[model samples]
Target: TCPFYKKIPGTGFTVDAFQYGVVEGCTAYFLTHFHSDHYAGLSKHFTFPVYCSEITGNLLKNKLHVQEQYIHPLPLDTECIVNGVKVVLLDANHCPGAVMILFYLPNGTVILHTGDFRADPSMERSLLADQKVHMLYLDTTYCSPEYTFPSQQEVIRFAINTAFEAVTLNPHALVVCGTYSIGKEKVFLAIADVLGSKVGMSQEKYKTLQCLNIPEINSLITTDMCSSLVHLLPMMQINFKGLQSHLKKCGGKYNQILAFRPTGWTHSNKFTRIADVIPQTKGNISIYGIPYSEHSSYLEMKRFVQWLKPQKIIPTVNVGTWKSRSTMEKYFREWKLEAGY
Candidate 1:
């Protein structure tokens, strides 16, 4: 909820802060991803040069209709000089075009900005392994202990297996995998392959997916609703009423509807096993809420901060309230103490 562009201290650069319009003395504008929240205030009207991953840049051009001339798609894991500042983009593992940014200032200060990322093991082994980070702008979306959930791969397997088992038992059931406009594609794509079903999406979503340019997904996409049993829809539309309405629109092609709403918010520590998390049903529609998150959990955040050992840390989300900000700061302090820093 960074409502306005944030000016990086001691630098003339701004990242993911587009709401305030173009700022004076801002040398470069960086976008971590194409998420609506991050790219807010950005439109075809703005003239500032935007820098981001190639995939993100494509989305900006295709979806937002931003001019290609204004977008500079930087290659991943490579050093790029922008306005005399050294910048590098690393795979964020959060979304298709998402990336964590590293900025090397002229004075030798290194700043690592985790732009809504899930902590991955390979991230530690990359360029971050030997660098001394002077500042860390962390994505503190789930900085509390209760936000814990299983790994993404494990959850994806669980979701696929659950959907497969259900579809097997009822071959006539319509499977709809809930997703955002950009993220959680791997979940639905794998589910489609496993069930031998085609993927269904709207024209807008299909255009967005095309920006990623994955041949596997391109071949499976279909606008003919009758041909595909597995459909991808916006996450909010996975509810009972929404599914019922959608099923009505389908002209009763199938018997029952099975949907999945995958996000970290659906997770609970009380469930000792992932299998124990069950679906809720109202009438012919059943929705499964699976723990599939893009942001880092508390333990992952701790591990990342501990390993990186940045001299300073800043919360990138939920910083509007004093209590939330203080709570995250306390967690950071505790993690630092545990690391004996």
Candidate 2:
């Protein structure tokens, strides 16, 4: 059952609905981002009046193919009164259509829900310094020292150097990389910047990138754009094997082949079957393992928490799991902080 909604002291608003479950007498829902983890349950289960940034709303409708009935699109950084609750969308640099939501209640308590954010100086300096955040619900995906990584600029530089080295070492070799379709466009752009050419993209990928206004990095051709790049062999023209065979064919003709995927490879599974098959038949295949991620690292997470200094930090999403929660609490305790709201 829904508790009696009261107005926030300074903002004149209230929140009656919860993200995890249905609260009775709730009339509005605010989505922080478009990621499946955040929006997965909403489309089918929760049928309330939902609100998000225009970009996020369009992304949900176009990418997720969700119905347009429930979404209410608003401009970024602008506050709106929805069912008497003041809501604001702040830029979240995690994905193409990600956002952080700020809820102002009538009790003067402000809740800032950072969906999935990184420690990008440009992003943080822009939003954090510009707004007055009271209670922050942060993303603690990598809230440990072990997951610490270099800066994004350093990662991009490494990618460029690696790509150049691979191309120079074996001019006739095809290079393939794996990265997330949405988040790793920067990596693709970096590779293209180094190569002084454009990378190829599937028609679908091209269309998606186009929407985000990503510039054409190279004159490289896509598989759909070039017929010879695709193999129409009858027997081995299905599934992973078929794709490998086709890639082998392309390697035979072209000087080098570069392929990138967001997943399908990891540190533990370094030498995957798919990786083995491509090089055996083709000239040479180099698998470059680059640490590219969009979430805040351990130190960054700590810094964010310290900056906010929320009275009670209620870990959510990634840190909600029992094992993960224990690990996260250890870090907080190590820093002389308490967990829970």
Candidate 3:
């Protein structure tokens, strides 16, 4: 377990801190989302009541098979008393069931633990607009000066436009989208809807989507692989070798392939601007690494601190490695100083 997974300073509660064994006096466990990294070490035998958003609760039941009794679904933006501490859940803006937890101790201490999130301006108004946060447990996944990328909407729009142009130019080009189990539904779904083409996915992924109960997905998803030009595959399958084999398996159904590998790792510090990052091509495959990240960029984290002005800031990721933490701390100190906190 990392230093960030320790129990809250003055509470018997742990927020996304289950990798380690249950701590002394730990009565409640709060899960930020359904992602494996956040829900690591969680099992049916643990027995402590788990608090999370309603959507997350459903995922836990269906995916992890956690007992219904142990799962406590908290309504978003609503306050609930847990061990006499007022707790609230806000949208994390990362995945479907992701949330940023807020805790208000009985003694007037306020703490906000942001599980993984993509920073959005609306968060400032919906959460922490009036309250002064005492302790802020941040998601420091991309807390570096060079980690900035275009906004999620911008990237999604670019992806849509790129797919549209590719299909228009090459009528038989198969559009393949890379996605995780729960996140990035917006991108592929938009492509399918705008292009007026059905989307094909593996049976396992289709079952997972059935749990989400998304309205638009019902019409866009198809079982007939031959009917849909747009197909959804895991990130690993979007590569050259995998797509090449998949095309060969298709037996010349599609003349070419246009694939999108969407992730934050696609954005690099070497690129001076977004325009410079171009699609890579090999034979019949044209691959675009889209900067569509679930985690907040460095600029987003900076703006978040400037708005909240938390008294104590804690880094949740890269803290166990001293060197990385030190580098992150340097940025934190500068941001805090500029915020005059």
Candidate 4:
């Protein structure tokens, strides 16, 4: 199902490569991040030299196990020559391995592509001032004004408050949160930050943290750290056996124990089996849904576009087709409100 020959269903360019395809004659190919949407077509068709942030390269190579030869890594803020085009990698706070790219064409045109970034004021301030951007290909996934979300700090506060409430209600209850390996690290750090005490560490998580060189977060406790919170409350564990033991130890002291998870916590068949294994603890188990996405909200997107003040704002991932044209137009109009020029 290569869509390149299909005219992209709308855009005039027949699938140039895929969504992120780079033509042979192009000066350089800049990859913003390791997300499937951004990197999917790279391996299949284009064998030309590719450039991305070092962390992103490691993620593809070490995490996804892609070959190193396929990647040409660039450090954050460092300018490099890719196929003779000057490209600089910038921090994109959306994900650990994410980055924004600024390309200086030989023709004197400057193009900035924000792969996927959130408007964390600090992140924006750090990246916005250094360069003059001519055109911006932005991430407009949440460009509508109606999309308002709590900040990361606020979300962490809410989770901590809720977790503490759960513990207070049932000292023996177990709390479990389900999140993807990479995305969940924020929640883990937030919890540990609030708790201010060392938690247990899992071997897998330990390795990941070490590789990332985030020793501060790695020192936090493992799932078993839940045990030290209270003697009556058994520690949580990444393994099923530990969860079972914690549940058994809780006994009848608390009406129910609380666990936090992603929206798909109980739905996936794999996790469904886990739910079944919890024995009589089913009715007493409470799962809370806390919406915490790493992507920027509508306001954040607008703010980013405004700060950069690009000549024309194009949607990078979701904005290339006719079906999405209206949405992109609406976003472009909205961005103009504060987009200085």
Give the alpha carbon lDDT tens digit for every residue of 207-285 in model 3.
Answer: 7776665776678797777788899888888889999988987778888999988777543634645555578899989
Compose the digit string of candidate 4's lDDT tens values, residues 1-341: 33332221111222123443444344334566655655666543345555666766666566555566767777777777765566667787876767776667777778776777776667556645777778776677766555555566765677777667666666655555554345445665665455454544445554444445455554555546444342212123423554445567545444445555432112232233221322223465554455566677776776667777777766655656776778768777766775546
Summarize candidate 2's per-residue lDDT along 28-135 as a digit string, tens digits. 666656555566555433456667777667666666666788778888877677766677777877877677777777776777777777756555565456556666
What tens-digit string does per-residue lDDT give for candidate 1 at 142-230? 88988878888888888889889988999889999887757877788888888987899888788888889677665778887788999
As for lDDT, the candidate ahead, 2 or 3, is 3
TM-score of 2: 0.73
Q: Which candidate gets the maximum lDDT versus the true structure?
A: 1
* Order by TM-score, highest first: 1, 3, 2, 4
Pick out the ten consecutive residues of candidate 1 with the lowest summed lDDT. 1-10
List pairs with backbone clashes in candidate 4: 4-15, 199-221, 200-221, 200-222, 201-222, 223-236, 227-235
* Residue pairs whose backbone atoms clash in candidate 3: none
Which sections of candidate 1 miss by over 4 Å?
A: 1-5
| TM per prediction | 0.95, 0.73, 0.93, 0.71
By TM-score, is 2 or 4 better?
Answer: 2
lDDT, candidates in the order shown: 0.84, 0.57, 0.83, 0.56
Off by over 4 Å in 4: 1-29, 41-48, 192-210, 221-256, 262-282, 320-323, 337-340
